[PDB]
Amino acid sequence: PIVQNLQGQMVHQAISPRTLNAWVKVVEEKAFSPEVIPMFSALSEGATPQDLNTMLNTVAPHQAAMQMLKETINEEAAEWDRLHPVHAGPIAPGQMREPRGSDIAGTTSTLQEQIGWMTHNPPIPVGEIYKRWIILGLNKIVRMYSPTSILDIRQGPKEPFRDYVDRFYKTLRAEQASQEVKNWMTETLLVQNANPDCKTILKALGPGATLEEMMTACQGV
Amino acid sequence: PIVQNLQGQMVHQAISPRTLNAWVKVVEEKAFSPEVIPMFSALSEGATPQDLNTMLNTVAPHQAAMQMLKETINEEAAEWDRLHPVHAGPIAPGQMREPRGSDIAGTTSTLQEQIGWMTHNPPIPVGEIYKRWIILGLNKIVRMYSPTSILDIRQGPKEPFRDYVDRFYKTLRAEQASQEVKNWMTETLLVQNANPDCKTILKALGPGATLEEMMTACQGV
Amino acid sequence: PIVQNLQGQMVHQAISPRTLNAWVKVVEEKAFSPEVIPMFSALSEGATPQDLNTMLNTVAPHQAAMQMLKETINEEAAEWDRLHPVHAGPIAPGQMREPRGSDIAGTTSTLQEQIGWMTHNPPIPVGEIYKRWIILGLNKIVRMYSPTSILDIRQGPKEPFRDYVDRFYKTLRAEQASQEVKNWMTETLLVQNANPDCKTILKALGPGATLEEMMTACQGV
Amino acid sequence: PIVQNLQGQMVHQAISPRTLNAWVKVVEEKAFSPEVIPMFSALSEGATPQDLNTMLNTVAPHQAAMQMLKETINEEAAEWDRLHPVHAGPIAPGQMREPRGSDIAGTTSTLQEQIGWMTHNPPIPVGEIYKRWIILGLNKIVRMYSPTSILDIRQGPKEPFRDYVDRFYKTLRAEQASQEVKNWMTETLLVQNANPDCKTILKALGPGATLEEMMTACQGV
Numbered sequence: 001p002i003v004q005n006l007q008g009q010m011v012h013q014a015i016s017p018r019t020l021n022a023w024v025k026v027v028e029e030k031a032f033s034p035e036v037i038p039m040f041s042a043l044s045e046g047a048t049p050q051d052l053n054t055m056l057n058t059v060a061p062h063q064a065a066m067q068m069l070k071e072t073i074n075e076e077a078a079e080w081d082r083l084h085p086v087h088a089g090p091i092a093p094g095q096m097r098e099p100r101g102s103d104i105a106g107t108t109s110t111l112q113e114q115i116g117w118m119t120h121n122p123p124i125p126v127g128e129i130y131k132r133w134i135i136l137g138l139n140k141i142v143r144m145y146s147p148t149s150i151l152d153i154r155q156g157p158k159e160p161f162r163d164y165v166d167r168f169y170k171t172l173r174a175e176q177a178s179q180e181v182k183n184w185m186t187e188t189l190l191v192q193n194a195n196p197d198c199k200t201i202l203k204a205l206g207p208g209a210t211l212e213e214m215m216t217a218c219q220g221v
Numbered sequence: 222p223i224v225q226n227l228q229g230q231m232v233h234q235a236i237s238p239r240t241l242n243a244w245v246k247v248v249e250e251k252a253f254s255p256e257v258i259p260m261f262s263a264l265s266e267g268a269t270p271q272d273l274n275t276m277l278n279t280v281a282p283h284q285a286a287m288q289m290l291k292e293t294i295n296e297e298a299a300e301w302d303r304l305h306p307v308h309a310g311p312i313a314p315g316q317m318r319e320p321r322g323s324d325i326a327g328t329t330s331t332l333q334e335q336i337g338w339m340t341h342n343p344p345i346p347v348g349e350i351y352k353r354w355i356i357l358g359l360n361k362i363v364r365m366y367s368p369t370s371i372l373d374i375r376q377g378p379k380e381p382f383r384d385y386v387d388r389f390y391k392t393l394r395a396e397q398a399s400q401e402v403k404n405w406m407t408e409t410l411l412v413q414n415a416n417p418d419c420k421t422i423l424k425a426l427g428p429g430a431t432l433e434e435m436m437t438a439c440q441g442v
Numbered sequence: 443p444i445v446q447n448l449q450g451q452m453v454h455q456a457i458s459p460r461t462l463n464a465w466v467k468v469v470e471e472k473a474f475s476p477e478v479i480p481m482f483s484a485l486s487e488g489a490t491p492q493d494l495n496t497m498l499n500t501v502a503p504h505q506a507a508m509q510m511l512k513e514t515i516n517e518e519a520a521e522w523d524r525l526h527p528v529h530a531g532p533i534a535p536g537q538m539r540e541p542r543g544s545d546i547a548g549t550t551s552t553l554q555e556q557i558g559w560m561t562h563n564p565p566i567p568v569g570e571i572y573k574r575w576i577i578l579g580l581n582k583i584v585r586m587y588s589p590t591s592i593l594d595i596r597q598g599p600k601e602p603f604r605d606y607v608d609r610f611y612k613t614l615r616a617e618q619a620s621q622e623v624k625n626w627m628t629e630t631l632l633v634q635n636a637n638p639d640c641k642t643i644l645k646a647l648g649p650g651a652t653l654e655e656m657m658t659a660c661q662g663v
Numbered sequence: 664p665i666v667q668n669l670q671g672q673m674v675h676q677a678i679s680p681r682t683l684n685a686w687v688k689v690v691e692e693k694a695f696s697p698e699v700i701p702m703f704s705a706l707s708e709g710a711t712p713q714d715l716n717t718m719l720n721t722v723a724p725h726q727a728a729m730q731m732l733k734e735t736i737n738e739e740a741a742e743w744d745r746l747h748p749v750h751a752g753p754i755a756p757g758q759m760r761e762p763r764g765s766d767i768a769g770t771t772s773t774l775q776e777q778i779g780w781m782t783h784n785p786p787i788p789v790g791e792i793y794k795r796w797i798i799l800g801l802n803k804i805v806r807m808y809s810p811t812s813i814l815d816i817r818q819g820p821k822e823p824f825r826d827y828v829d830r831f832y833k834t835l836r837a838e839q840a841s842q843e844v845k846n847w848m849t850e851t852l853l854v855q856n857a858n859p860d861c862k863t864i865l866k867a868l869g870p871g872a873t874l875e876e877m878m879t880a881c882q883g884v
Binding site for chain 2: 015016028058064149
């Protein structure tokens with residue numbers, strides 16, 4: 001992250017060892033469950049590209065996930081270079097240069113360059129964009145590691161309705177289908193795969209019933 | 222680690238008690254699993270040789286692991302002395318002397334010497350090299366304590382494919398074979414030791430199929 | 443082969459009918475076992491490219507093996523042409539021209555050309571190189587026809603250790619893995635797949651035990 | 664071998680392809696049984712060191728046997744060099760030089776040198792000595808590959824006595840014990856391990872009975 005010294009200047013501060021260890025525990029203990037993404041977003045709050053690469057070093061022992069992340073990052077960097085062509089000409093002495101795709105990811109840039117780029121009026125967030133690319137890669141990884149399809153999430157004969165709903169929505173978040181497909185799933189498949197008693201109640205409830213009404217009507221069933 | 226005082230001078234800061242306690246919990250509770258190495262790397266982030274020896278004091282009650290670490294450290298120090306002979310002659314007043322193998326490990330050096338050595342332009346990282354030697358020793362220890370061979374990692378009849386892949390790759394990381402041998406293992410043994418249904422599907426998939434394609438084709442099997 | 447006439451001149455001699463019949467028996471009766479390669483090497487001893495094509499005519503009824511051989515030969519001829527470019531310019535009257543890839547295989551050359559090329563001071567062996575290409579093709583064929591993986595070679599409960607070792611090494615020769623992979627196989631998999639009594643003895647024997655020591659310790663078990 | 668041309672000069676003749684194929688069949692089909700040694704002696708009759716190395720090329724795919732052969736050959740060559748020191752001084756123009764250990768094995772010598780060395784009055788057999796070294800190596804290999812100890816050769820309850828004697832003596836030839844130990848074995852162990860009826864008859868026959876008398880007395884038992 002970025003901190004201010006006693007002289008009022010923006011200075012980079014390294015990630016604390018226990019934050020890095022929390023990230024390591026998340027990587028090594030949760031098997032790339034969907035909750036890894038909110039935890040990564042929280043643990044990398046206000047980070048620099050060098051800090052993000054330090055956090056990514058934890059993923060390196062997982063070859064498939066790391067390769068997927070690297071492919072996503074390279075594609076995003078190529079797209080960034082395509083959409084931000086290197087202008088040929090003079091540059092104002094008071095204005096800093098434009099970083100490239102290899103520079104936002106911190107492959108060739110330095111710490112001071114990123115500190116200056118992030119701290120500006122108006123600021124151009126380089127850490128946030130790299131973080132978003134990491135999140136795209138992580139979403140792909142979570143999709144790859146998902147053990148069950150949404151079509152295989154069925155309510156147990158004695159399973160409470162709220163637990164079935166939680167499992168269903170967790171699997172839906174893992175799968176990351178299209179928005180229209182997701183809406184169709186939440187509207188139709190959730191009712192379709194319920195157990196007979198809750199299914200009868202939900203059918204009696206009618207189409208267009210909100211999730212709150214369904215959980216109310218199926219609370220003790 | 223190294224911190225800056227109000228006067229702008231680099232000053233050593235001791236490891237916080239809770240970071241040391243986290244390291245103690247890792248040592249005493251995980252039985253030298255492969256995840257001990259990323260956790261040690263995170264918890265010793267930006268540390269000095271004195272801090273590294275403080276962290277190593279936790280390993281001392283484990284006689285075999287500590288002896289293996291000491292052997293690896295002594296061998297690395299001897300190699301460092303061989304590759305960095307003590308030059309006989311004058312030394313510039315503004316340039317500090319060259320530490321020996323017993324000095325990078327902090328056996329004979331002092332805190333100020335290591336602080337000066339690490340904080341330089343350009344810097345010579347003494348903490349990182351000692352840390353790498355520790356990691357070599359820890360890798361040897363993890364290999365020693367591994368309970369199962371990779372040849373004994375077989376998918377259960379009802380075990381999901383992703384869990385089998387995770388166990389297989391964790392054992393592979395523990396064993397630390399040669400790169401060519403590791404590639405052969407990931408290409409052949411993973412398919413060989415799968416359960417009959419996934420094995421049939423993977424055989425139909427053909428050689429050279431990526432891990433993502435295999436996990437996709439075996440998701441619900 | 444090449445023989446000398448009464449005048450001291452090198453003359454080509456055709457392969458005897460019974461040598462050709464021995465080669466035919468090898469091709470038609472052994473199902474491309476690994477021993478086909480030493481037998482082909484012995485039976486084609488000191489042969490000319492025309493003789494080698496005569497021997498290859500026996501393989502033609504086997505479409506897959508013959509196609510694999512032709513692909514290997516064409517690739518080797520293309521590589522030979524690439525590494526031996528046709529020089530444009532004068533040629534010494536006493537020095538013969540350089541054969542092409544289609545010429546070493548005897549597709550376009552004549553018998554006298556090959557006789558002169560092989561009989562020279564210093565000699566340039568054209569028959570040996572074509573033979574080596576044939577051996578590469580035959581190795582590929584033997585790999586294709588191998589019925590069992592090395593991972594499936596397991597010592598029987600009452601099988602003598604020497605027979606298990608012979609089967610293991612025959613399969614290893616058939617598979618033709620990389621040298622490092624082969625060393626790992628002979629060091630680890632042979633012990634891993636032995637029966638419980640021999641496995642206990644070999645484990646007690648320790649790593650780095652020679653094959654002779656293992657066969658001595660497991661002789662009557 | 665060595666043949667004479669029309670001018671009366673000794674000329675080397677290569678081994679015929681079918682003799683080499685017979686040797687290949689012996690190597691690849693008999694699993695280093697004791698009969699491999701008489702067959703090698705017959706098939707290498709009157710051979711040159713180059714011919715012997717050509718025959719040894721068949722053994723190369725068998726790593727353990729080939730390594731044992733190479734160790735025996737190197738030891739014999741070192742002993743030959745020790746017992747035949749290189750004399751420093753003039754050499755007669757009509758007398759050829761003394762080959763070294765690397766020269767009798769054909770590693771550095773040429774065909775003409777060996778032809779001249781073998782064809783002399785009086786002749787110094789270089790092929791025979793190399794052949795004897797090969798036979799020592801092969802005897803070691805046959806000992807290594809022997810599946811049963813002599814102590815485990817026991818006559819079956821209905822096995823004819825002549826077959827038991829043949830198996831016993833074949834195992835004894837494989838084991839190659841000391842002469843006194845071999846005499847003790849043939850005198851005591853053969854009677855000891857016979858079946859009860861033949862054992863009773865042989866005990867009644869008394870010590871010092873010849874093998875012919877034993878086979879006569881046990882013919883139909």
